[PDB]
């Protein structure tokens, strides 16, 4: 039983993050992968995402070749040269993360960790035994997929890892499911050209942003030519003789239900949700607390109902974001290394962006949030809708919509909801005035940038 | 003698900021425009200057199409196109502008103003004499032009006013200055296609900005195509048979001058200063003082040295931007019509961006203000370089620097530069948390947005 300061299970964001910082600190750790290090961030979400988004959009920007003065870009979006490139990228970056672990002198274990029936805390991978005083799970999630017993022919459709496994561009795509994930693949999709829908339970995407951005959100969406299927849900997949045929029922409120064949498609996508890889833990071994989907119960310090058993990232089901499990990593391996007891991770204002187009980017409260937490009377909401002046001389339009969410007669600003171009790189700075408690009055005293978007926000009246 | 609560001569960005609150104050105020309301900034300024930009980020977007999957685009940029739409839209804001000032009930006077002999300071607009309390000078700069005297032929030269009259794309262009304007011509024209010189006495651009800022910049423009001819200044210019030729002198220190001739010029363009618009105001009736530029003094109130006077934008020579001409407008008008004695603008920290490729942004103190400030051993920076994302895929290569400059123990942070895609949009946000005096701890508590550019100055070590 080889005995370690620190031992980490999941080499993902959150476990590389926490395992990197606690070596700083002279922690002896180890961090066991059972896959690829750089865990979903690197291989299947953030990073080939971001790169996918940076290809739709250079499709969006040659629409507008034209009208800019110079002459018509004709064609055909080759999919296999900018796969091939992205991965490249993502194995380059995996053996960057590689050494990170090395020159930091962090044990890596290969193999797939699963807790053990001894009494102190003990995990085996491969047949040896591990332990320390303090074990980090950080194996984050996966994307759901529905049962076979509910959805017949649902194991035809992917998921977001089978859409990074792609190598042509489907003709006729069907995306199902309207959270961030949905939205970001059926543009991508829609943008380098596959006949996208995207099928979705209520009217709008996104419901749990604010109300301006899910309602904008959805008419950009039909803008740039996705069909977006309202009240609609699958209630089969079967494969035909020419791709698959998806029935599906839509059920607008206030009329009869219309069931609906779509026949010839290509790719059908389920992002629907994504589930906690606890599962093959043997967390019961030690009764580590669990919630119904399978997340890790935590407190405010990462803490599990066991001592020296932590959880962070995405297993825990909270912020399921790349910056929030290095965050919430970091703090933690302060507090146990550090002996800083107070350090944990503030999970509120935490800002996100969407890669729509245009994008989106959130901090704080959506205005419904701040009227249930201070009442109406006392939030005031600024906002404005304006065409960047990106468009002043396209044929093809897109829209900037700002909204700041105020409390008390102070003004506080507790919420900032935006989408439109460049609203992807304009959000973290505000998201530190945010954090640092800003009024209306600080914003209204800081000198605007001339010409910008990001000046609309400090001019707001 | 038409007697108003406000005059306001000079209808640009200060002057119009400054009547449109005044009068919400109740103040019965008149407009005095010689040319086009709109001023600098929307005629031959911030507007015009945008749309050329975004149309030189087309060119540079357009050359890694290839490299994103799609087919290489071949062609000729169109200039007359691009000129024709910037032309409209210039036009389309004219507009909006006049019926700003109609919808607020100020009057609009055409003409050319100057001051009177008058006791009480009075103004007279084409043989009509004018008065009132208060009486704002706003009337902006011009392009310095070098005198034939110092430079001969220097008349055959154009400024960036006459750059927006071009209707063709010069073939070979030569820009002299090294200021932001030279920066962004050249950035411009080399973009867009014309061979491209930009002629500067030292050996960096930008040199009041912070060192980082200058030496990357430098690079950046030459690994765009711009040659800059470094310790050179023009000598005299001439009309040959087929265009100009420019005799310079480039003196290198530790080396002999040696004089070169540029033949076959298309354009050269003077971006060496910017001018008073003084001169024909008859101030001199009044006494009221100026620098020996031309600039109007004003004290912190944007009073000048004669009551019942003031002094904002260009006209005072500090800070020549479109935004502080408006901000000091507005805190003036407060201050006249609200009673607010206190209300004037604080010139610091006061955000630029210049539009080169890749953009710059630039708040607060550079490492050598700092250093002059507060003392060597209480100044820290923090600073990172790297090649954005968008770049993981292309030949093309372009690099994002930023830095971070921190004083006392405290880090409070001072200034922040940075160079890099996305720092046009990325700047507003940072400049409300510099101006609420955010120390560094308060950036490293702000979770980041990932994967975009702007998360690196929250995660600066
Ligand atoms: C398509 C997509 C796009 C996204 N886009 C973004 C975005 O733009 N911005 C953003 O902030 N977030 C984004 N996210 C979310 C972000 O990627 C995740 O929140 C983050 O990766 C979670 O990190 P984690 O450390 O919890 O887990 P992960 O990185 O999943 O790491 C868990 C690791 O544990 C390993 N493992 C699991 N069980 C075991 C075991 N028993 N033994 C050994 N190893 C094990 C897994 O192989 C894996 O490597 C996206 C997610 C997806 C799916
Ligand atoms: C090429 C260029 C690019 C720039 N780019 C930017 C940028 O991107 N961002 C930015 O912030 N700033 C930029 N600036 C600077 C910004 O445009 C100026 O700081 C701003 O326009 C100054 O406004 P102002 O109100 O002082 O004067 P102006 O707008 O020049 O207005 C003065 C007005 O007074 C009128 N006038 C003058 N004398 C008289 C008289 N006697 N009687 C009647 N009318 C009179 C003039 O016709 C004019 O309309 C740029 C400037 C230039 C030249």
New interface residues.
């Given amino acids: 039983v080889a005995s370690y300061d620190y031992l980490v299970i999941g080499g993902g964001s959150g476990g590389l993050a926490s395992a990197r910082r606690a070596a700083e600190l002279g922690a002896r750790a180890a961090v066991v992968e059972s896959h690829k290090l750089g865990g979903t961030?690197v291989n299947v979400g953030?990073?080939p995402k971001?790169?996918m988004w940076?290809?739709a959009v250079?499709?969006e920007?040659?629409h507008?070749?034209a009208?800019?003065?110079?002459?018509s870009?004709?064609?055909?979006?080759?999919?296999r040269?900018?796969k091939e490139?992205?991965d490249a990228?993502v194995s380059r970056l995996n053996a960057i993360y590689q050494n990170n672990l090395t020159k930091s002198h962090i044990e890596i274990i290969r193999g797939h960790a699963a807790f053990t029936s001894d009494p102190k805390p003990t995990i085996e991978v491969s047949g040896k035994k591990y332990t320390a005083p303090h074990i980090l799970i950080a194996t984050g999630g996966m994307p759901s997929t529905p049962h076979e017993s509910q959805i017949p022919g649902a194991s035809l459709g992917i998921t977001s890892d089978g859409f990074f496994q792609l190598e042509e561009l489907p003709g006729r795509s069907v995306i199902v499911g309207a959270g961030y994930i949905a939205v970001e693949m059926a543009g991508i999709l829609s943008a380098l050209g596959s006949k996208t829908s995207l099928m979705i339970r209520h009217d709008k995407v996104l419901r749990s942003f604010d109300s301006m951005i899910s309602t904008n959100c959805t008419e950009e969406l039909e803008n740039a030519g996705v069909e977006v299927l309202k009240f609609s849900q699958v209630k089969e997949v079967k494969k035909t003789l020419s791709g698959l045929e998806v029935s599906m029922v839509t059920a607008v409120p206030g009329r009869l239900p219309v069931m609906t064949m779509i026949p010839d498609v290509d790719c059908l996508l389920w992002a629907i949700g994504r589930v906690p890889n606890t599962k093959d833990l043997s967390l019961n071994k030690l009764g580590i607390q669990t919630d119904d989907k399978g997340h890790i119960i935590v407190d405010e310090f990462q803490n599990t109902n066991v001592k020296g058993i932590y959880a962070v990232g995405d297993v825990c089901g909270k912020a399921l974001?790349?910056?929030?499990a290095?965050?919430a990593g970091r703090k933690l391996a302060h507090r146990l290394f550090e002996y800083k007891e107070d350090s944990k991770?503030?999970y509120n204002?935490?800002?996100?962006?969407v890669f729509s187009h245009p994008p989106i980017?959130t901090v704080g409260l959506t205005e419904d949030e701040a009227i249930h937490k201070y009442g109406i009377e006392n939030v005031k909401t600024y906002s404005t809708s304006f065409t960047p002046?990106?468009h002043?001389?396209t044929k093809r339009k897109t829209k900037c919509v700002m909204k700041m969410v105020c409390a008390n007669k102070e003004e506080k600003v507790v919420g900032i909801h935006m989408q439109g171009l460049?609203?992807?790189?304009?959000?973290?700075?505000?998201?530190?005035?945010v954090?640092?408690g800003?009024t209306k009055a600080?914003?209204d005293?800081?000198?605007?940038?001339?010409?910008?978007?990001?000046?609309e926000?400090?001019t707001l009246r």
């Avoid at 009208?67 to 002459?71: Q, R």
């Avoid at 609203?423 to 005035?433: H, K, S, Y």
């Fill in positions: 961030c953030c990073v971001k790169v940076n290809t250079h499709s920007f040659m507008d070749h009208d800019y003065g110079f002459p870009c004709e064609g055909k979006f080759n999919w040269v900018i490139k992205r990228y974001l790349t910056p929030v290095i965050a991770l503030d204002n935490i800002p996100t962006v980017g002046m990106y002043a001389v460049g609203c992807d790189e304009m959000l973290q700075g505000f998201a530190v005035a954090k640092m800003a600080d914003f005293n800081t000198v605007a940038i001339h010409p910008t978007s990001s000046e926000l400090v």
